[PDB]
Structures are given as C-alpha cells and as structure tokens.
Amino acid sequence: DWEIPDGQITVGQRIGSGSFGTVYKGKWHGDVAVKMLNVTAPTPQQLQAFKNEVGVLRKTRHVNILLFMGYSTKPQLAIVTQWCEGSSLYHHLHIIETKFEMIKLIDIARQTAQGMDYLHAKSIIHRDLKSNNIFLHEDLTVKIGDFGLATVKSRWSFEQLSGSILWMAPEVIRMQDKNPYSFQSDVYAFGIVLYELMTGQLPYSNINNRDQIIFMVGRGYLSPDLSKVRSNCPKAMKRLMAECLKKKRDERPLFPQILASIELLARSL
Ligand SMILES: Cc1ncc(NC(=O)c2cccc(C(F)(F)F)c2)cc1-c1cnc(OC2CCOCC2)c(N2CCOCC2)c1
Incomplete structure (x- = not known):
C-alpha cells in the first residue's frame, strides 16, 4: 500500500x-x-x-x-x-518574467490540457487551477498540483474558494447556480492560464481595484483583453481562448475538445 x-x-x-x-x-x-x-x-x-x-x-x-x-x-x-x-508558471511569467518561445508556450498549454483532461476523466474537478498551481519541473514539464496550505471547508469532498479571483468563472463569483463548480469552471480557469501564457500578464492589469474586478466579472461586464496576445500567437489559439473564456458555462468546450484543438494547432507551426 x-x-x-x-x-x-x-x-x-x-x-x-x-x-x-x-x-x-x-x-x-x-x-x-x-x-x-x-x-x-x-x-x-x-x-x-x-x-x-x-x-x-x-x-x-x-x-x-x-x-x-x-x-x-x-x-x-x-x-x-x-x-x-524548477519554479511555478506564475513565478516564471510574473516574478522573474521568463520569455518563452511561442512553441514552448503552446507546449505548456498542451501539457496543462493533458493533465486537466486526465483529472476530468477521473471525475476530479480541480476548483483552483491557476499558474501558481502549474509547476514547471526542470522549467520544462508541467506538473499540475494544488499548493495551497490554508484551511478549506470541504476541499476534496462544494463551497467557494478565495484568493484566486482572476481565474474565477462568472458563475463561481456569483454562487447562484445549484452546482457552481463544474468541469466548465475549470475550463474558464484554464482560459485565464492561456491568457497568462499568450500575453505574459495577469488579466485586468489596468484596473487597480480588486472589489471592482470581482463585481464586474460576476455581472458579466468585464472579460480579458485578447488583443494583448503576442503577435505570433496562432489564430486557432486566440479562438480557443475566447471559447474557454465564454461568460455562459454551457458555451465553453470540455478538455477532450480543448486538447484536440491544441494538438492540431501545435502541428501547424
Ligand atoms: C507535499 C505536497 N503534498 C500534497 C499536495 N497536494 C496536491 O498537489 C494536490 C492535492 C489534491 C489534488 C491535486 C490535483 F492537482 F491533482 F488536482 C493536487 C501538494 C504538496 C506540495 C505543496 N507544495 C509544494 O511546493 C510549494 C509550492 C510550489 O512551489 C514551491 C513551494 C510542493 N512541491 C512539489 C514539487 O517540488 C517542489 C515542492 C508539493
């Protein structure tokens, strides 16, 4: 055992x-x-x-x-x-500000989509996917984890998680649905990770008020600015990002589709 x-x-x-x-x-x-x-x-x-x-x-x-x-x-x-x-993807992108090549950014995206596709197939909803929870082993291989050390009522059993608002789907901010966390809320978080990869930045960098960001995402007034993506970001990637970031959870694709779309656009480079 x-x-x-x-x-x-x-x-x-x-x-x-x-x-x-x-x-x-x-x-x-x-x-x-x-x-x-x-x-x-x-x-x-x-x-x-x-x-x-x-x-x-x-x-x-x-x-x-x-x-x-x-x-x-x-x-x-x-x-x-x-x-x-190695270091977390958050550390790489936002602290030391590593400049990965487009080919590697897509590779990190593909690897994260594989891990998330695997979790969802085992009926595991992560509920806290973010760049801090993506570790880059030898700064090359993605290791999805959950590195939080704070007390959480029913973490791996449900209730709203905090301190990860930038990766929170509109319905997760609202908490009005019968079941707010779903495979689709994980997909929205993944859409934010793609934004971090393709822009090198955290969304809503030009809004200095966190309470206003929460309010606006929940009301559906604010969405990440996709024109900030790097010049050589494939069009199919920008398209995938917009689908993952859809305000209505039903309009979001699931990880088998997401993984198939990344595998296909990685071939065309
Ligand atoms: C020990 C340990 N035991 C259980 C968990 N649990 C999980 O991941 C977990 C729990 C439930 C579900 C899942 C899911 F992702 F599969 F859905 C994952 C995490 C850790 C742990 C915490 N913090 C760490 O490091 C800190 C944070 C990173 O930066 C460095 C400091 C590490 N690392 C590992 C890599 O090597 C450097 C040290 C591991």
Whole structure:
C-alpha cells in the first residue's frame, strides 16, 4: 500500500506553511516534498480533510499531475510527493518574467490540457487551477498540483474558494447556480492560464481595484483583453481562448475538445 512506516522519511528544510499544513523538503528514496498537517491529534473533520486529499491523489497516475508517492500516519499525518527542481508558471511569467518561445508556450498549454483532461476523466474537478498551481519541473514539464496550505471547508469532498479571483468563472463569483463548480469552471480557469501564457500578464492589469474586478466579472461586464496576445500567437489559439473564456458555462468546450484543438494547432507551426 501507500502508507510509509515511521522513521523512513528524513524531514529537511521547511518551505512554507498555512492555517492547515506545513510543507518541507525531505528524503525518502531520493528528494521528496512532505506536507504535514499542523496538528498531531486531528479532529474527525481534519482527519477527513486529510483522507479526502490522499483519496484524490492516489487516483492519479499521469506525467502532468504531481506524482503522489505515499502518506504517513506516524509520527504525524503527512503526504509525500516527488520533489521538482524548477519554479511555478506564475513565478516564471510574473516574478522573474521568463520569455518563452511561442512553441514552448503552446507546449505548456498542451501539457496543462493533458493533465486537466486526465483529472476530468477521473471525475476530479480541480476548483483552483491557476499558474501558481502549474509547476514547471526542470522549467520544462508541467506538473499540475494544488499548493495551497490554508484551511478549506470541504476541499476534496462544494463551497467557494478565495484568493484566486482572476481565474474565477462568472458563475463561481456569483454562487447562484445549484452546482457552481463544474468541469466548465475549470475550463474558464484554464482560459485565464492561456491568457497568462499568450500575453505574459495577469488579466485586468489596468484596473487597480480588486472589489471592482470581482463585481464586474460576476455581472458579466468585464472579460480579458485578447488583443494583448503576442503577435505570433496562432489564430486557432486566440479562438480557443475566447471559447474557454465564454461568460455562459454551457458555451465553453470540455478538455477532450480543448486538447484536440491544441494538438492540431501545435502541428501547424
Ligand atoms: C507535499 C505536497 N503534498 C500534497 C499536495 N497536494 C496536491 O498537489 C494536490 C492535492 C489534491 C489534488 C491535486 C490535483 F492537482 F491533482 F488536482 C493536487 C501538494 C504538496 C506540495 C505543496 N507544495 C509544494 O511546493 C510549494 C509550492 C510550489 O512551489 C514551491 C513551494 C510542493 N512541491 C512539489 C514539487 O517540488 C517542489 C515542492 C508539493
């Protein structure tokens, strides 16, 4: 099974922490990432939140999904994943401002679409897809993860997630539908990731008020500016972006179509 016996993991450098967990770099048959719960004696809800996450990760076996490696219960409840040298797509695009070639931007898009197509086939709705959750292993291979460390009521069980408003579909901002999170809300988030790749920027860079952005997207008054895409961005890519970013969720394509469209436009370059 996937349970790792006590004393096998060497916990190293602390990377970060939030209200729910703390991530460390470690050693277990090579470099690993270790995410521990902040409490040693968890409540029935905290333990259920932990088991829910292990439950989703253990269903994944795909090169574009962060490789789950096992979990521990002793001395603490922890999740073990592969350790990746590299940086998140967010870090590359918006912090160090890496200038990838169009061919590589399309390659990153194709790889993300593969991982998302895989998750949706396993009935997993991510609910927090964004460039921060796309890791570039050796600055080349996409590893989709969920790197948030904050307490979330029913994360892998539902309720609205915050701090990722730029990637939030209009119906996710509103919270008026019977089921606001869907494969289509993940597709909208993916449409924002495509915008980040093709422009090198975060949407709505010219609006300095976050509350106004939330209000406007939800009302359907604001959409990303597609004329900001790089001069050599293929027309088929700009077309795909507009379909993913549709205000009405029913008008959005699903990942089998998205992946087929990227595979086809990557051939024509
Ligand atoms: C340890 C761990 N255990 C469980 C999860 N869970 C998930 O991903 C997860 C949970 C549920 C569903 C899914 C879905 F995507 F499949 F839908 C994924 C994440 C991490 C972890 C947190 N934070 C990290 O790094 C920080 C953030 C990046 O930048 C560096 C600091 C890493 N890395 C790994 C690469 O190598 C550098 C360190 C892994």
